[PDB]
Design a protein around this ligand. Structure first.
Ligand code: MN
Ligand code: MN
Ligand code: MN
Ligand code: MN
Lengths: 198, 198, 198, 198
């Protein structure tokens, strides 16, 4: 059974960048629903599989990817943020960033653009290509998870579904992206990077 | 050149079902952006076509469908709503509804379910199948327009992108759908129906 | 464990409409690989589900839908054909066809159109819509199965992957469609239609 | 007006790797239809654009991407092959291949994998990423063109639609891939690589 992880900080810890109302709805309602629905779908999957019911397994895929993906993405998102966050990363990761994107600023532009470029609901990601052995930016639709659909290792994700910013920034998604950089938890991102550089 | 149509009523005319803040942002910001971006993309399309640049034409498709679709959908949505709205339709349309969906209530359930069922951004629609000569409910992702992608004639659309309801109903999309029935402009929907029954 | 079903007839039982070489390859090779690959994929899925590895379950979806769908579709296809096929259905089924498509001739043309219309690999289908309670035609891409991705109950399917006709008809898919009508097992399609008649 | 390009060689110039029957059908029939169908689609698009008919422009996208992509891909494919092909590239291109894929052998295996991996119709590609400034492998479905749907500049493409190999290799696509390496026109791929070398 999958569970909703506790937020690693207070709901208002990311203010004024992401307000408390958004954080609370985001965690207690949106993420909660993803794990609850995921557990329901996996149980139905368990039943379909035991029966060899291929039709049922296939009909269940949209719900499994959407809900399971929702859980995966938000669980990573919470850890990617921090009240003491902001600034730039250091060492090997910063090395890679400058190497793979020219500079930190060029990286910010590219990730921002990938995030602002999502038409509809989705996510912008900084990931790691284990095969090429380098960093890579990608965008995912709806709740499609980075690794399950692209094979890339998630390092930093930016949720651009409207529920992630609308109450505070309304239609101005670029202001939300500008503000989020101030709360990125580079320690966590670094951790994830070093974890796949092994 | 495409233009942003005036709303056929005051921004607060649909209260308390859809508040004025949402209507104003919805029309003046979201729809505006769709037509502005559409005009930009069509102009680029005009250039690509004159040159026989197939690659450019194809690269331009996502923006054309998204923005052009945004314009089509919202232009219909505004007319599908009315301050004096609500209740049930009459005559031939009501006939079709009962015939094709069992009853009005069964129709409401089905359209609502199609609308609540959209994972991510999208629209729920009551359309008309000219080939089969009957009504049909469908759901469209992001701004994909009903007719251009399904061939069905739009009669009644329900925008379920989060910007269409979040500020007022937050994560509770079912409350938004419950409320919207009170402002449906059945006169307009009837008009559209009789227009394709010719 | 899923198994490759024997054909209801000899490989050259459908000559000259679909030649022996095609039937043998299509069954002994194409279908064979789908069943074996499906079993392998399911096993991996059972393991991923057991560990609660969501990323793995998601990464396996393409293979499950592709191989499971290939198994579902082909199993249906073989029973939809018969050396003594051809002509038209009778009683109930014929009645429904006249009712929903105007006439048997029109229906053939409609299903032929959906089949010829597939860009790339796929399938053309005559299915039953339980909710609306009527026949419906649909086209599915690659091996996406009708019921699992659409909800319609499959009654008659036409495989338009090039491997289904290229050796004999080359690039002229319409010649293949014209020919297949001569071997359709209407007895089986009728059986399938009467089964979901609720 | 787009036109069907002549082949740079005789239909049986690539025997025994890709037989004459395949080359003739592939070029004189498949490519021929894409160019003619593309022109017809473009005309309809110019008309729809002129009227500002957005629904029509959108309904035409599938045909434009499919036929325009078919024209783009095949035009590239013919120049990527040569009776005197085979072996490996030299200088700059080879250098980049060793750099981004480890070795030429590894690169072949990577591109073979992408090509064999396509479920349904499609294409496997070696392209150039202008932003990252390196080679990249990608697979495209049906006739979706590489640059128009991905941004990568096409350098070498491998057609894995069944019509590209079924008459000769039947269901065994890997045998086709092994064979094609013997006719790759590295002179042309090198030319394409040096052209986007900015
Ligand atoms: Mn979210
Ligand atoms: Mn909207
Ligand atoms: Mn087949
Ligand atoms: Mn081809």
């Amino acid at each position: 059974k999958h569970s909703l992880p506790d937020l690693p900080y207070d709901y208002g810890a990311l203010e004024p960048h992401i307000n408390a109302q958004i954080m609370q709805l985001h965690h207690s309602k949106h993420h909660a629903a993803y794990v609850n629905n995921l557990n329901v779908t996996e149980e139905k999957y368990q039943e379909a599989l035991a029966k060899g019911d291929v039709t049922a397994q296939i009909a269940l895929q949209p719900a499994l990817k959407f809900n399971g993906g929702g859980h995966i993405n938000h669980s990573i998102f919470w850890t990617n943020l921090s009240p003491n966050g902001g600034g730039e990363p250091k060492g090997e990761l910063l090395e890679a960033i400058k190497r793979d994107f020219g500079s930190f600023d060029k990286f910010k532009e590219k990730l921002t653009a990938a995030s602002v470029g999502v038409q509809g609901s989705g996510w912008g990601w900084l990931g790691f290509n284990k095969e090429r052995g380098h960093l890579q930016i990608a965008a995912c639709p709806n709740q499609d998870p980075l690794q399950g659909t692209t094979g890339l290792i998630p390092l930093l994700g930016i949720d651009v579904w409207e529920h992630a910013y609308y109450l505070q920034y309304k239609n101005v998604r670029p202001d939300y992206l500008k503000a989020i950089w101030n709360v990125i938890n580079w320690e966590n991102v670094t951790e994830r990077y070093m974890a796949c550089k092994k």
